[PDB]
């Protein structure tokens, strides 16, 4: 079931999401399935649950980046090195900006079946995760733009 992605301006993208407590359940497996499908129909590499108006610590992502579904995520930077790179947002369609993120992270959480997940990530993999994590804490990419020359429409830049 493809879901409606909500757009910037909606208060539901501004909340801080509660934890998932139904790992292994059929309801959650259904929601994850929906999320991968919705992510695919919109052509994303990442999608957080608040983007489809579900208030939960849950994200999907993957392109190389492993196709992953991740609940109750925590992220730890592994150095102070930041890197710049392009981002967009299915909730801000048409736009893109350059955004500084940590080059090296570790993330931890659970697969939908209850299995623990813990990985080190770098570059693009690491960026997609930082970006979706931001959704879980009510934060969007414009608030991290440093150089506003880079903010523009995809077809123009
Ligand atoms: O809406 C989302 N993520 O929340 N979508 C982004 C994910 C992303 C993150 C960082 C760099 C590029 C892309 C997208 O256009 O696929």
- Choose, from 37, 83, 132, 146, the residue flagged as catalytic: 132
Residues with CB under 6 A from ligand 1: 44-48, 51, 87-91, 127-128, 131-132, 135
Residue of minimum CA distance from atom 5 in ligand 1: 89
Q: How was this structure determined?
A: X-ray
43 assigned to a ligand binding site: no
**Topology (CATH) of 1-157:** Peptide Deformylase (3.90.45)
Q: Which long-range contacts (CB under 8 A, 24 or more apart) does 63-70 make?
A: 64/125, 65/124, 65/125, 65/128, 66/125, 67/36, 68/111, 68/117, 69/32, 69/35, 69/36, 69/111, 69/112, 70/107, 70/109, 70/110, 70/111, 70/117, 70/129
Q: How far apart are CA 15 and CA 137, in angstroms?
A: 6
| Ligand 1 center–CA 88 separation, angstroms | 5
Domain boundaries, the chain: 1-157
Residue of minimum CA distance from atom 16 in ligand 1: 44
C-beta of residue 117 within 8 angstroms of C-beta of residue 106: no
Q: What is the resolution of this structure in A?
A: 2.4
The beta-strand segments (E) located in the chain are 46-48, 58-61, 68-77, 82-87, 95-102, 104-110, 116-122, 152-153
Q: Give, rounded to a whole angstrom, the gap between the first and last alpha carbons of the chain.
A: 34
């Amino acid at each position: 079931m493809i879901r409606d992605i909500i757009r910037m301006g909606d208060k539901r993208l501004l909340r801080v999401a509660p934890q998932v407590t139904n790992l292994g359940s059929a309801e959650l497996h259904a929601l994850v399935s929906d999320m991968f499908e919705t992510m695919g129909a919109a052509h994303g590499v990442g999608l957080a649950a608040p983007q489809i108006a579900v208030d939960l610590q849950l994200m999907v992502f993957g392109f190389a980046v492993p196709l992953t579904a991740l609940a109750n995520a925590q992220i730890e930077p592994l150095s102070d090195e930041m890197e710049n790179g392009w981002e967009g947002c299915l909730s801000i369609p048409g736009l893109r900006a350059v955004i500084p993120r940590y080059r090296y992270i570790r993330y931890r959480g659970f697969a939908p079946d209850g299995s623990p997940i813990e990985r080190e990530a770098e570059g693009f993999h690491a960026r997609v995760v930082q970006h979706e994590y931001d959704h879980l804490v009510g934060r969007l990419y414009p608030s991290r733009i440093e150089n506003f020359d880079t903010f523009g429409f995809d077809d123009v830049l």
